[PDB]
Amino acid sequence: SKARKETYSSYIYKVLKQTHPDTGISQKSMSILNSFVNDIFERIATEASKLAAYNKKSTISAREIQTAVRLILPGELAKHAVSEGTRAVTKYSSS
Amino acid sequence: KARKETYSSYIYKVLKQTHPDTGISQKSMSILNSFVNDIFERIATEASKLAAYNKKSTISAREIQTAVRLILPGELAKHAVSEGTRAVTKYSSS
Amino acid sequence: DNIQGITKPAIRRLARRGGVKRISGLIYEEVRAVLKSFLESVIRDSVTYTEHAKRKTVTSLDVVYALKRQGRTLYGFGG
Amino acid sequence: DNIQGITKPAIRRLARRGGVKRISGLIYEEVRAVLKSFLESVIRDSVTYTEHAKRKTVTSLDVVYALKRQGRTLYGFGG
Amino acid sequence: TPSELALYEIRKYQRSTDLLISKIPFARLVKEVTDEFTTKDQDLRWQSMAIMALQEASEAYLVGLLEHTNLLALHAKRITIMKKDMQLARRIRGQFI
Amino acid sequence: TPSELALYEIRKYQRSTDLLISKIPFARLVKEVTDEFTTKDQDLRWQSMAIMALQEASEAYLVGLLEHTNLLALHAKRITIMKKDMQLARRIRGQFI
Amino acid sequence: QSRSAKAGLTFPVGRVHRLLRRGNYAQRIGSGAPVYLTAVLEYLAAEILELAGNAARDNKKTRIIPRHLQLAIRNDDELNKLLGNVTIAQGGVLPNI
Amino acid sequence: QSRSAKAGLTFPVGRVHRLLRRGNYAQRIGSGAPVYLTAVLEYLAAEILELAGNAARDNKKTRIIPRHLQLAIRNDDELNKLLGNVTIAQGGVLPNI
């Protein structure tokens, strides 16, 4: 048997449709970008909860994630990342 | 009397059994304490990792046996596996 | 036995990719030495991973895992 | 000019701990530069750790966590 | 043209995106390395995919070390690399020496 | 004896176990680096102990890079280090270049 | 209505939520954390794939390939710091000039 | 009777067990894991501390100091692989010849 495997490939392809509607993706490229988000997710979350443990505070929260991303990303990308995280969570909380 | 904990006294008596005459400076003691902390962190992160890898809810003595075998160079690894097996056997006593 | 299969013209081609245009001999045998070291280290790591999984097929999961353990994350194949 | 206040006899004696005895003059300026770069990054990491911790006094645990994340982990302090 | 042909050759396998070591050789090499590392009784299988990832890591490291060893030769005001030269380049990079 | 005195000097600060940079300079240096990195309104204090650990990490890295840059000069068959020489040594070590 | 839709995100905020639960990083998770993390991941993915698409435009073809990805990631000097440790599958290596 | 006492190990294995609990390494903490790793840690500490004893003997200072610790741990060739990137405070560096 073979269990259903987690993937973000549909979302990756959709955002590529938004960017370049005429462009497709190779299978190897799609596996590569599917691995991108999981690798980033891990190296953000571990650092964020380690920072939370340094705070000796129970909850991993938005401030912890913001700090973790701005720690680990190179600064030029970090500015964009924190701005987009903040505006996204604000748009959500405005619901 | 809100006491505070550390590895310093336990490390000190370890040094006593190895060499009762030899003393230790407090900063060397801090180096040893942070050494035990760092190796604990390494082995425990490897334990969490291997547990997620085998999709196991828990940390097994055998999966951290494996983690030690990954982390340690061969000589220290063989010594550590022997020591840990001995200590598991002796802790099982009561 | 087959480390010689990684042969002097082959490592010459590797060095063309590297950007050299002059190469002496003994470079060659020790390139085999470093390749031996890399292969055995990562192989040991992946082997330990699978045998702790009580499997006997060292698997790409364990190889990309051993590579991340070695500090270099080969990237593209899940992981 | 604090990094110039890091004096050139100082950089010299550091070279002599470094095991060298002859060092060009612009090494002094560029050893100042390398100290500047490493200090800048470790200060970034430790200051940000401090900012998140809400104790806005920069702490030794912040410094050692910075060095640890950098891979330059230092002993005797987180213990 | 020797130089023109060989430099063109650098560029074409430099921008080639793919692995380039001989394959059946590399596969049997890893197979025998596992066999000798493994023992009498416990033997280990290898699928396509592990062999894959092993290959790519080996290629990438040796090419990285290759520009560095080429560069230490460049620093010697020469264009041959030698034992001592690369031996050093790698060892200065630290791991495995 | 110039060589005898200077080599003896290497050995005595080589086996000296302690930090050796000028202290009030280093402390005010970190203080102003924090001040310039920090902004208008949020300002940050420093105790003895953070300044300590910062110092030791800086000392250790610069001395490590120092043997490496000395060694790249040794590889140039010379004993002066230059901009390009060390610039490279560090940059080959990778981080911060 | 889905959480991703309410956020304006394309990526699966709910999957990031449940994965944070699987990754045992902390026992209590703020509700804003998964959406913030999903937004960050979506931004990074969009940036890298846009760079790869422009690389494909440079290569004059309408499908992304690992060579395009490797060229983009290596050329962007910030994402090369972010993924300096990564080597891409069938990604190759960048030229000397 | 105590679990930390019946363990026959210096470091209290109860503290290690509850550290593993709050360390989020997994949902359940196998009771043999903390005692095993405590013993491994105790043996490694025994290595460092018998080096401390013989360094105190060699250097004639009865109580071990960080200089001696750094010298012994840097002389321990196999252990430096574990502690390669590691550096020690107030330890200086072992003499290069």
Numbering used by the authors:
A (entry chain d): 34 to 128
B (entry chain h): 35 to 128
C (entry chain f), D (entry chain b): 25 to 103
E (entry chain e), F (entry chain a): 133 to 229
G (entry chain c), H (entry chain g): 17 to 113
Question: What's the paper's own text on this?
Answer:
The point centromere of budding yeast specifies assembly of the large kinetochore complex to mediate chromatid segregation. Kinetochores comprise the centromere-associated inner kinetochore (CCAN) complex and the microtubule-binding outer kinetochore KNL1-MIS12-NDC80 (KMN) network. The budding yeast inner kinetochore also contains the DNA binding centromere-binding factor 1 (CBF1) and CBF3 complexes. The inner kinetochore centromere-associated inner kinetochore (CCAN) complex (14 to 16 subunits) associates with the centromere, generally through specific recognition of CENP-ANuc.
Dimeric CBF1 binds CDEI with its basic helix-loop-helix (bHLH) segments to position one of the two CCAN protomers 5′ of CENP-ANuc. We describe an alternative DNA binding mode for this CCAN where CBF1 assists in the topological entrapment of DNA via the CENP-HIKHead-TW module of CCAN. CCANTopo engages the 5′ end of C0N3-CENP-ANuc and topologically entraps the DNA together with CBFI. S. cerevisiae CCAN topologically entraps the unwrapped C0N3 DNA, 5′ of CENP-ANuc, in its basic CBF1:CENP-LN-HIKHead-TW channel. However, C0N3-CENP-ANuc is orientated differently in the CENP-LN channels of CCANTopo and CCANNon-topo. In contrast, for CCANTopo, CENP-ANuc is rotated by ~150° about the unwrapped DNA duplex relative to CCANTopo, bringing the histone octamer closer to CENP-LN and further unwrapping the DNA gyre to avoid CENP-ANuc clashing with CENP-LN. This allows space for the CENP-HIKHead-TW module of CCANTopo to adopt a raised conformation below the CENP-LN channel. The removal of DNA-phosphate interactions from basic residues of H2A-H2B is partly compensated for by CCANTopo through acidic residues on the α3 helix of CENP-N. For yeast CCAN, however, the topologically entrapped DNA duplex is the unwrapped DNA terminus of CENP-ANuc, whereas human CCAN interacts with the linker DNA of the 171 bp α-satellite repeats of human centromeres.
